[model samples]
Target chain A: ESTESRSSFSQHARTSGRVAVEEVDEEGKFVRLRNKSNEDQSMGNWQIKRQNGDDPLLTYRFPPKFTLKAGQVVTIWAAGAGATHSPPTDLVWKAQNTWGCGNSLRTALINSTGEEVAMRKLVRSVTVVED
Target chain B: LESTESRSSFSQHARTSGRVAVEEVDEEGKFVRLRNKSNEDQSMGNWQIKRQNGDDPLLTYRFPPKFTLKAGQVVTIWAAGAGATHSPPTDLVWKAQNTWGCGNSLRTALINSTGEEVAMRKLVRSVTVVE
Candidate 1:
C-alpha cells in the first residue's frame, strides 16, 4: 500500500485543464477548486495538498465516489471549528486552525506570503499557487 | 509582525527535531540527498521542502505514517523515475516528467531564483533561507 512514486500524482494540470484552484484566502482559511471541463470528474480517491513554505504537507482527501460536475466550484474551509459540509461545493477541514500554531492540525493550508494547493485525481494533478 | 530573516523567519522545532536536511542536490538528475543528523532514528512522517515562496512547489513527500529513518541514514529521491527501494540510503522516485526544470545558469535545485527565500520545514519549524 505504501510506495514512492509521483505516478500516483502523475497527472498534470496543463493537460485536461478540467480542475483548477480558483482562489485562496490570505489567512489560509478558504480555498476554491473549480472543475472547468464539460463532464463530471469522478474524484473518488483524489486528494488536495497544501504546501506552505517549509511546513509539513497538509492533505485532504475526498470521500469515496465523489463527483464534481462541469463548471462546478468546490470551496474548502481550512479552519472551520463549527462548519458544516454541503455536497460537491461546500466542504470543511473542521480543524481548529489551518496552520501549525500549537494546534492539533499538522499544517496550514495557506500562507500570507504564498502557498500552493494541489488537487490530485488519480495520477493527474492541478495546482494553484497563491502569493 | 513577521520579518524575512532566516534566523527568525521561523524556528525548526515543531513537528521536527531539526535533524534532517538537504545534503546534496543533482541538477541534471533532479535528485536530492537527505540525511538525518541525530544518533537516533527519526520519523519523517510529515516533512517537506519548497523552492522560493510564491512559486509552484517542486514536490512534497511524506514517509509512511509509521516510517522511521535510521541514525545518520541518507536517502536520495529522483524527481521522476521507478527506482524506489525500501532500504536505507536507498533511492526513491517521484515519478514525473521534466524532472527538474533547470534554468540556463541556475541549477534545478530547490533554491529561490528571484533572490527570495527557500525553506525546508516540518510543520511549524520553517527553516528559511533568504537571499
Candidate 2:
C-alpha cells in the first residue's frame, strides 16, 4: 500500500550541485553522470571504472577535451540484454554479461591524476525516512 | 625542538578546548579555519590537519615553520591546486587539489605537533519534516 512517502532527502540531491554519480540502474545496467556544477567541466583522460573490492574490473576512458556542461547528464550503458547507446548523452561499454541483475559493485569517476571525482555503490539500498 | 615544548606544558591542554582551535570549515570554499583566542600569539608550525574518510586513506597537511597566528586572530587554510601562494596572514594555502570539496562524508581533525588532537569537524546530514 506504500509506493511513496512524504519524507524528502536533503543531501542526496546535494545542494552543492557538483558533478556526481547521478543515477545507477539495476536492471538497465546504466550509470549516469550528471554535472550540476553550473559550469562546463572538461575531462582530460578521466575514467569511469568499475571496482570489485579494490581492483578495477573494467575501465572506460573519456576522449581528450570531453566536457560536461551545466545541468547536463551522460549515461554509460553496460553491455547487457537490450542495451543500446545514443550518442552525445549516452555511451555503451563493450563488455558483455557484466553489471547485469544482482551484479553490483563500486564505481568511481577518477581524474587523470588518479583522484576520484565521484563514486557510488551499485547495490540497491532502500530506507524510509520519517516526516 | 619546538615539539618538546608543547608536550610538556600543552600536555595539560589535552581533552580540553584550548585557546587556539579550528572554528569553522567551509567545504565548498575548500578551507579549514582556525582561531587563536588567547592573549598571546600561538605558534602553528608543524600543526597538522588530517582528513579522514572510510574509502580513502588519511591525508594530512602540516603548518610551515615559523608560522604564528596572532592573538585573537583567525586564519583560513585553503586546499588548492598548484602555484597557490603558501603564506598565512589570516589567509593561507595548502597545495592539494581536492580535500573536503569532493562531496564525501568526512571527519577532519587538527593535530598538534606533539600528536594531540586539538579540534575536529564532522560532516553530517539532517532530516527534515514536511507538511
Candidate 3:
C-alpha cells in the first residue's frame, strides 16, 4: 500500500527583499476563501488602509460567510499606508483565525515589524482528507 | 504563440473566483472559518451545530479562500480546527489558498483539511518577508 500526504500550492512570484516606502503604486488589500476547495464560487474579501498605522481600515466584507470546499484554494490582498510592500515574504501567518484548520497550512504573507506596509496580494491552496 | 502570455514565474495566481472566511470548529457545529490564515497559534472555535447532525438539519460551513495550485510543490500548512470531523455525503469541505510569495518561512503542527476529512498536523511551510 502507498501513503499519500495532504498539501497546498501557490502561484505568484515573491520579491527577494523589502520595498521602499514610496515604491508601491496602488496599495490595496485583497483576500479570498472558498467553501469548496474543489468546486468554484468560493467566498472572499478585500481591504485597503490609508495609513500603515492602525486606523479605521476600510474593508469589503462578503455574505454567506465564504466556504472553503475540499481541495480548494484561497487568495488574499491588502494595502497599508507606510510603504509599498514588495513580494511578501514566503512565511504566511494566520492572525486572529476563526476557522478550524487555521494552523495547518502555510501563510502567504504577514506584517510583523517596521511601519505596516501596504498589502497587495495573498493566496494559497488547501485540501481535506476523506475516509 | 505559447510564449505570447509571457512568464507567470513572476506573477501570482490571483483571481475573482475566491473567498476568505475565518474558520474554527465548534462542539455543536462541525465546520467553521479560520479568521487569520496564518497566526502560528491555531485557535479554532467548534461548530455551532452537531458534527453528526443525527436529529438536527445538516448545517456545515467551509471558510477557506479556495483556489488551485501547481502539483508537486511544498506549500505552507496554515490551518487549525477543533479536530477532525468525519461524516457521510462528505459533509465537511476542506480547502486552502495558494500564491507565490512571502518573506518568513517556518513549520508548525495544526489541524488541516483535505478531500473530505480533517486532522491536526503540520503539512506546509509559509514564509513572511520582512524589511
Candidate 4:
C-alpha cells in the first residue's frame, strides 16, 4: 500500500491533502499530487457531489482493453483543456471513493503457483493552465 | 465487467470477494497469515473490506503496493489460489460503493484519442464471508 498527505492550501488557506490515485492491475501502485498552495484553491474542480454539497473526490479507472504487447504504460491525471474558452479549460483536483491502485491479473496471478506480481506506477505532470 | 451468484456447499451455501500478499521477495513471493480462521484464511478475515472501517478496501493502494514498468512492457494475469477450509467459505452480502463500470469507461472510449484501454475483471462474487 502507498501513502499520501493532505495539508491546507496556504498558511492562511482552508484545506490541503495529497491527491492520490489507486490502481488495480498487478502489484498495486499509487501516486500523490505534489502541487502545494497556501489557499483554498484546488488542484482542479473534479468534485464528488453529495447532498450536503460537493466533496473533493476523484475516482476513475482505465482498463487495458484495446491491445497488449509486452512493456506498455499509461498515465491518468486530472487534466482539463478545451480550446473554445478564452482561457483554456483547466484541470480540477478531485478524489475517488471506491477503487485505489492495486494491479492484478484475471488468470495467473490468481491461479499460478510461482512468484508472479503486478503493479501500477506514475508517469509525469504537465502544466495546462497559462501563467 | 462480469457478475456471479454465490451458493452454499451441500446446500451449497455461498458468498465472496478479493485482496493480495505481503511484500516479500523469494523464488516465489511469500506472505505471513495475520489472523486467518477455520482453515488458512487471508489478508483479512473477510474477502474484501470497504473504504472506511480502517480496513483496506479492494483495489485501493491499501490492498497492495503499486508497481510500474516502462512502456512496451507486457503484463499478464495468472490466477492463484489460497487454502480455504469448509470447501466454500461463508459469504456476507457486501453493499459496495460502485465504481468505473460500462458507461463510465464506455464514455471514456468515445473521447480517448490515445487508442488505449485497460480493465480488471472480477471472476467471482464481490461479497466475501469466510465459512
Best by lDDT: 2
Predicted candidate 1 versus true structure: per-residue lDDT over A11-127, tens digit per residue: 112112356655555455766677767877667656666555455767776666677798898887765434468877887877536623221112222212234333321122223
Measured with C-alpha atoms, the lDDT of residue A129 in candidate 1 is 30
- How does model 4 score by TM-score? 0.14
- Candidate closer to the true structure by TM-score (higher is better), 2 or 3: 2
Question: For model 2, how does the per-residue alpha-carbon lDDT over A1-131 read when each residue is reduced to its tens digit?
Answer: 11111211222222222567777665647878888666877876789777644544777777766778887998878776445776658777776445544434566788878877676654333334333
lDDT of 1 by residue, B50-92 (tens): 4321244554444344546578988776666434443444666
Candidate 3 wrongly placed segments (more than 4 Å) = A1-11, A14-122, B1-120, B126-131
The TM-score that candidate 2 achieves is: 0.40
Tell me the lDDT of model 3 at B49.
16
Instruction: Report the lDDT of model 4 for residue B125.
Output: 15
Checking candidate 2 for backbone clashes, the offending pairs are none
Q: Grade the docking of candidate 4.
A: incorrect
Better of 2 and 3 by DockQ: 3
lDDT-sorted candidate list, best first: 2, 1, 3, 4
Specify the highest-TM-score model's number: 2
Model 2 shows how many backbone clashes?
A: 0
Kindly indicate the candidate among 1 and 2 with the higher lDDT: 2
**Candidate 1 chain B: 10-residue stretch with minimal lDDT:** B7-16
| Candidate 2 regions with alpha-carbon error over 4 angstroms | A1-131, B1-16, B82-87, B126-131
Q: Which scores greater on DockQ, model 1 or model 3?
A: 3
- Give DockQ: model 1: 0.02
lDDT of 3 by residue, A45-83 (tens): 222222222333332332233433454434433333222
Q: Which candidate is the best by DockQ?
A: 3
